[PDB]
From a paper:
To understand the structure and function of the [name] eut bacterial microcompartment we have determined the crystal structures of two proteins with homology to BMC shell proteins, CD1908 and CD1918, and show that they are well conserved between species. We have also determined the atomic structure of CD1925, a member of the EutQ family of cupin barrels. The sequestration of ethanolamine metabolism within a BMC is thought to protect the cell from the acetaldehyde produced as an intermediate in its breakdown and to prevent the loss of this volatile compound and its carbon from the cell.
Residue numbers in the entry:
A (entry chain C), D (entry chain C): 5 to 90
B (entry chain A), E (entry chain A): 4 to 90
C (entry chain B), F (entry chain B): 2 to 90
The structure:
């Protein structure tokens, strides 16, 4: 139940990232969050290997259409963290 | 009619002009606009792949004329889970 | 078929937008249909009417915004499609 | 029925402006608007002379505690403009 | 107990530390916080003039320690119409 | 009397905040009480608990935020007044 996250400056890069992630591997899109300042984060859940593959694909995609700001995976997130996810 | 075209501008005027140019350039459907702060506005259309490419190219040119274009992209066949984060 | 003409003025700041709006409705027989704000301090005011009225209004509004130092964008769409009409204030 | 407007970057300057305006002359506070980007506008209504006096006082005050961005008076605003005021 | 003290910071942490320092420095009442975008957060207290001056000075020092202070001001006797635009 | 200790981490970006939050709750017995966003991309995550637990959590969270490049502010208030408690998530 790993968590993968990609943050972009702009919604277009985030949607491209999200689409590339769920196409690339056996992950599920948890949703998107807009925190202001133009930053948009999209997130997926799945096995750690699938989430690594998905986030690599998403980050490559975001970078080509937009502004990749960050990409990270948390392999075993703590249950409380779900409270602040989309 | 599943392809998705997206145009993002800094400013609303650019996005409205983009949306109007899109729907006039080809038979595509305007599905909404989203604002994410810092002035960034995105407008999106759906349609068949060819129409969406033509529309998004036209929209991008229109946004460049009146405003500030930030991003332009077409996804020919979005994953079904992606529909759930669209406006 | 097309929807009524649309004139739009975008300013950095609300004061410029209100000055623009006031000048627009004073200059011509147009309807002020609202304002929208998209962050970063950008505010857009919009009018609808006949094409000539909207052109005259928007030119007056742009001048007023530029006078007080706020003008980012100005544009008229003489014959907007209804699809777009549907995403306006 | 003149309209006076002061825009500041920050709420503190706007509240100081508003307080100084209504203290300075026979004007009424219409309200405040926050348009994003940190910009806050406060507005008053009254006779043109009162609104000129009020806005001068408010602008002087905003400048001392904060960031005055703009100050302007519209002497005879058109009725449609009320639709987009606070 | 009508005086108004206001502290504005870029960032929420600075504002929370300011608010805590204010209410600990003197007998003043925290009346709320407001966010106006671009990261700017304002916290406000009410109290008697002396207390509010002391509290706001303490709050400002606390905000400077942990964050970014933007503005600090005390209005001893706000106009009654000003209450209507406060949080 | 005072309310439970409070630890806060502010980051530029949500990814840094989630990394911080995860590290905080992993490092100590604290309650994650929420996140707040105030524009400009700034996100704050907060935990409550006993003072020592909150100190340990917040130190772990700050490290994690700094590792991924996002850290703006970090602070613990060991004994917050309830008035403040009242304006938190």
């Amino acid at each position: 139940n790993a968590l993968g996250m990609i943050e972009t400056k702009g919604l277009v890069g985030a949607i491209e990232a999200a689409d590339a992630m769920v196409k690339a591997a056996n992950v599920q899109l948890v949703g998107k969050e807009q925190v202001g300042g133009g930053l948009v984060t999209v997130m997926v859940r799945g096995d750690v290997g699938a989430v690594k593959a998905a986030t690599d694909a998403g980050a490559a995609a975001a970078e080509r259409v937009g502004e990749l700001i960050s990409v990270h995976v948390i392999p075993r997130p703590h249950f409380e963290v779900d409270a602040i996810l989309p």
